[PDB]
Symmetry: D2
């Protein structure tokens, strides 16, 4: 909940994007993506509880949002396979990260809100 | 064609937004919006030929894009009455402005590309 | 708080946009913009308490965010005079509206989240 | 130049994002990313000539834009390592794709324009 949150919105319906799968990976020493955490957005479009302050160490993380399944379920054939962000976390000490994504069938926009606990 | 261009994209269909009405206004000394230029986007989502260098002086301009009519034509319920973009232009003299807009039914994004 | 909320984020700093002025207008019978409510975003980038369920009737509303003052205070000369959205509210009965804006010096993006109470 | 174009804009400076590195990969049968094409954006923020119709077959493609290096060159601390854009292309045969990206230090937006 605390250190990594994901929020997903639907720009076609003006709503949270509900029950969207989110997969988080962390780059290992051998430069491969290791599975780190995953979950589904709630009825508010939010995903909390992915990790903890102890587990969320320095690293390069990928957050991969399964936008394709979301659109397909609504009868839309979308462009992207997913929406993903890749970022270095906690380089200058622990921070809280909110990754927000705004979804359309042929477009997405993502931002990060980073705060110091 | 040169000093002020508008380009509109459709984020739902992954295409230019074609036949979108665009009106441009300039702020008058009494803070009312005076009609300045208008047009409809082409098949490429672009609208050129709005003004000339001589006519486009420093001032506050409003570009109003009729997004509601566009979505209604597609049978999609939209949130906004329109998308407008208000900016100060040609202080520091003439400049070249492209106002781009990316449209979704319940969201839009606009950016300005100001080049040479 | 309930029926109309505004949230503003800074895409340059990855932060809420704090202490941003927001002015709300409602179109009168004579097609003029009448002042409806105003406020400032908090340290979380949020503005609650603008109106109430009784006051927020059907109408065409404008939300005008003073982005120019925000950027100027940070030493940036931005493009826009403001970021504004214009929308019809409560056409099909009362709804809750969240207007979110994401700000950059030469760009902004706005979305609406509309829910049924 | 024809089937796959990339265009990158800078939302902070209101300009094309120039000299941005772009790498394109195609997903291999073993789910690894195989190098496909690359280049740097021009003075107009555009990158043409990546592939040809014959080479650009249906598959899953990744366009990876090195946004971090771009912001570092400007002395601005960025959030993302890069901006990547993953999509399935030429099922239903060849198509024309423009991948556009709008960059800020802590945000980006991408849209696809798929025309005739
Ligand atoms: C219109 O522009 C966009 C808006 C959004 C919405 C993002 C969103 O809801 C963000 C959030 O809900 C996160 C907000 C936030 C604000 C201040 C804080 O100090 C904080 O950490 C404690 C968190 C997402 C994508 C967009 O393109
Ligand atoms: C990808 O996000 C965006 C793209 C554009 C398109 C600009 C152009 O085609 O020149 C405009 C606004 C956006 O938010
Ligand atoms: C939605 O706005 C329009 C779009 C088009 C182009 C293609 C189409 O028919 O969708 C033509 C006229 C329109 O008014
Ligand atoms: C930030 O990336 C670049 C931008 C430019 C163009 C103009 C400038 O100097 O800012 C040139 C080389 C770069 O690597
Ligand atoms: Na460090
Ligand atoms: Na009604």
């Amino acid at each position: 909940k605390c250190p990594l949150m994901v929020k997903v919105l639907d720009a076609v319906r003006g709503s949270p994007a509900i029950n969207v799968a989110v997969h988080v990976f962390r780059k290992a020493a051998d430069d491969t993506w290791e599975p780190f955490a995953s979950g589904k957005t709630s009825e508010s479009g939010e995903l909390h509880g992915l990790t903890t302050e102890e587990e969320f160490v320095e690293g390069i993380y990928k957050v991969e949002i399964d936008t394709k399944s979301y659109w397909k379920a609504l009868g839309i054939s979308p462009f992207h396979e997913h929406a993903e962000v890749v970022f270095t976390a906690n380089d200058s000490g622990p921070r809280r990260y909110t990754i927000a994504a705004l979804l359309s069938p042929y477009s997405y926009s993502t931002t990060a809100v980073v705060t110091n606990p």
